[PDB]
Amino acid sequence: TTALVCDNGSGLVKAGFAGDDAPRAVFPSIVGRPSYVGDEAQSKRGILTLKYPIEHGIITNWDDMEKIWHHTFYNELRVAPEEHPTLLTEAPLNPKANREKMTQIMFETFNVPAMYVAIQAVLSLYASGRTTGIVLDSGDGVTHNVPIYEGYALPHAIMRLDLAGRDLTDYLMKILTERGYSFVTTAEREIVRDIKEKLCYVALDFENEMATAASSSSLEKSYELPDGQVITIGNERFRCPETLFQPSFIGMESAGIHETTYNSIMKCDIDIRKDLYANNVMSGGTTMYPGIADRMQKEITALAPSTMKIKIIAPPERKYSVWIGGSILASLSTFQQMWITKQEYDEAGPSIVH
């Protein structure tokens, strides 16, 4: 009778059982029309047209999303959806009509006994044993700043940055051209994503790091491409994640992740700001870069008042914090009375989720 937990990421789906400390299934959010979903769509790349149903954290293709959910239940988890209550995650600022459509699909298409829709950032804070603090959630297609007070997100102060890991990989492909390297295809994009995850880091002082890379080979690294050709990466190691702090690197006139965190805290009541500043939680794969917490600590310290105590919490499993949070939430007995039941759905309709 175990509850299911499904984190619908813009790049990866994380699915598993509530009560578990990790998802059992982690696969790409892709549909390859003839249909193939996840790993099989990626493996058969050459004969398929790949589509991402979750552009920028928001579900845009419901036919393809049903395929993902079906693949999650039947092929990945090997469960009958009609037997398990299901917690689904949603992006901060997800439209009411969007969660109504996902509630309608859960009950009418998969026939779930019960279902709950939780904000991804809130689950990440729960996974750190907290109910108050500000979450920086940077995934594959979107980045969010979500201030939370006593279990509840503060919607007026939520920041959205349309810049996450996917844009960083495209930027890394772009700046690798400045060394004579050419990565343009979808397959080559995946090689550059691997280089990004293995060799990139955030510099504490960007200008001094650029100056060090300009006068010595000490920051250089080698990378073996699939065909055995070894390439050399230099300042691109830190210039790529630097875009998170300086979005002008990719032509965006948006403020960096440190500015949006500060701006989010400042739109909150003075009385809770000390609690937000001391409980800054990083979540998502795009916060995995070495040095990002130290750089964030320094950037927030320069913006905040001199005596403000700043704390950055970047757990080692922060790539799975949203999923873990959902598993903690759905596994609590006293939450078993918050699920929207199939009975309540038949009587009220998709509006019950609000």
Binding site: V26, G38, T131, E317, F335
Partner: protein, 398 residues
């Protein structure tokens, strides 16, 4: 001093015992480095102490999934794979008919040959003086060979060594009584070189960091050459996988059913280990996936295990703040190998590693013979997960 986390309490090891291991010290050092480079915890199932010099020599290939016959841990055949499995380790003798069929089918199918057993003077002196596995040699009347005796725990069997010269090397061919008549002892040899094979290194488990968890961790059923060619896109395959797509024998010898149940991370780490050991082109020690995905796992045969961990585990608070170092609670030898002696100690080791953010892969077969099922999803939950749920239930009023 004591490791305390929720219901887990570990006392610091009082008097450190030294455990004799069959894995050569130099291979332990390589694996300690691989663990650090790759940021993974690597566990390897036991290797009998007498196999040490055979592996150290680097002259032999080892048994893969096509050679299911057990190696021997006694007599002059110690470290080799007798064709007559009554001369193998105890587990093979317990199911003699099944293991003899394994031995015969591997040879009859071409995945091995029937080879003679030759031992050098260094090996004979080691078995007699170092391990006391063979009794001193004596010239036996008429026969012309040197008689020696060996015990399997239940019975003492006589063996005879004939001085021979193979490839101009002076060796001792092993002989035994088959129906009261002298007979050359047969061991399982490599199907290409015809040389006797040794035991392999069986990965018990590989614990990767939580931050590294992804699609590469999906454990997948072996695919046939056809099923695999249909599932992949040729252009996306590296030269290594393109060669397997173009040669069925190459795919079946290095991939497919020969690996067992494996994930992409493990297929890669198996290559890294084999490459770091300097063992390629038939002499590889790691042939297949970990025991955590082996449906035929025998827990009794998994200890003592050697675990290799990233170096931070050895630091003052490597296991976490106020949690101490791994050497405080587990026996760590000079090469950095953490020696796990039994299922209870393995369960404690896995909980510490899980608490430090390294993911376990549990085999239900590991619970067979246990007083309690230690290796279950619920019992091995991370203490960070359990603690955050306790804190959140208290704060949200649930």
């Amino acid at each position: 001093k004591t490791y305390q986390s929720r219901d887990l309490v570990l006392e610091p090891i009082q008097h450190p015992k030294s455990i004799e291991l069959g894995m050569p010290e130099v291979d332990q050092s390589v694996l300690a480095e691989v663990a650090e480079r790759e940021n993974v915890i690597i566990g390897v199932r036991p290797v009998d102490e007498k196999s040490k010099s055979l592996i150290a020599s680097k002259m032999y290939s080892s048994k893969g999934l096509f050679v299911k016959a057990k190696s021997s841990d006694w007599g002059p055949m110690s470290g080799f794979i007798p064709v007559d499995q009554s001369f193998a380790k105890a587990s093979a003798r317990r199911d003699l008919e099944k293991f003899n069929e394994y031995a015969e089918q591997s040879i009859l199918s071409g995945n091995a040959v029937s080879a003679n057993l030759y031992l050098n003077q260094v090996r004979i002196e080691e078995l007699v003086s170092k391990y006391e596995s063979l009794t001193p040699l004596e010239l036996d009347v008429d026969s012309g060979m040197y008689k020696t005796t060996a015990t399997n725990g239940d019975q003492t069997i006589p063996f005879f060594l004939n001085k021979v010269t193979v490839d101009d090397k002076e060796l001792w061919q092993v002989h035994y009584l088959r129906e009261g008549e002298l007979a050359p002892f047969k061991v399982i040899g490599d199907p290409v070189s015809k040389q006797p094979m040794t035991a392999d290194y069986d990965l018990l488990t590989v614990m990767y960091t939580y931050g590294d968890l992804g699609p590469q961790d999906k454990v997948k059923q072996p695919l046939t050459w056809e099923q695999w060619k249909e599932s992949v896109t040729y252009e996306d395959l590296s030269p290594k996988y393109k060669a397997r797509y173009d040669n069925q024998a190459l795919y079946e010898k290095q991939d497919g059913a020969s690996l067992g149940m494996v994930s992409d991370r493990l297929k890669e780490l198996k290559d890294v280990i084999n490459t770091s050991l300097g063992r390629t082109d038939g002499l590889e020690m790691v042939h297949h996936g970990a025991d955590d995905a082996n449906p035929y796992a025998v827990m009794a045969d998994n200890f003592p295990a050697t675990f290799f961990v990233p170096k931070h585990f050895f630091d003052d608070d490597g296991l976490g703040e106020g949690k101490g170092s791994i050497q405080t609670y587990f026996n760590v030898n000079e090469q950095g190998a953490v020696v796990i002696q039994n299922p209870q100690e393995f369960s404690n080791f896995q909980q510490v590693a899980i608490n430090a953010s390294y993911r376990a892969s549990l085999n239900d077969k590991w619970n067979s013979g246990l007083d309690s099922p230690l290796f279950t999803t619920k019992r091995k939950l991370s203490h960070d997960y359990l603690d955050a749920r306790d804190e959140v239930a208290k704060k949200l009023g649930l």
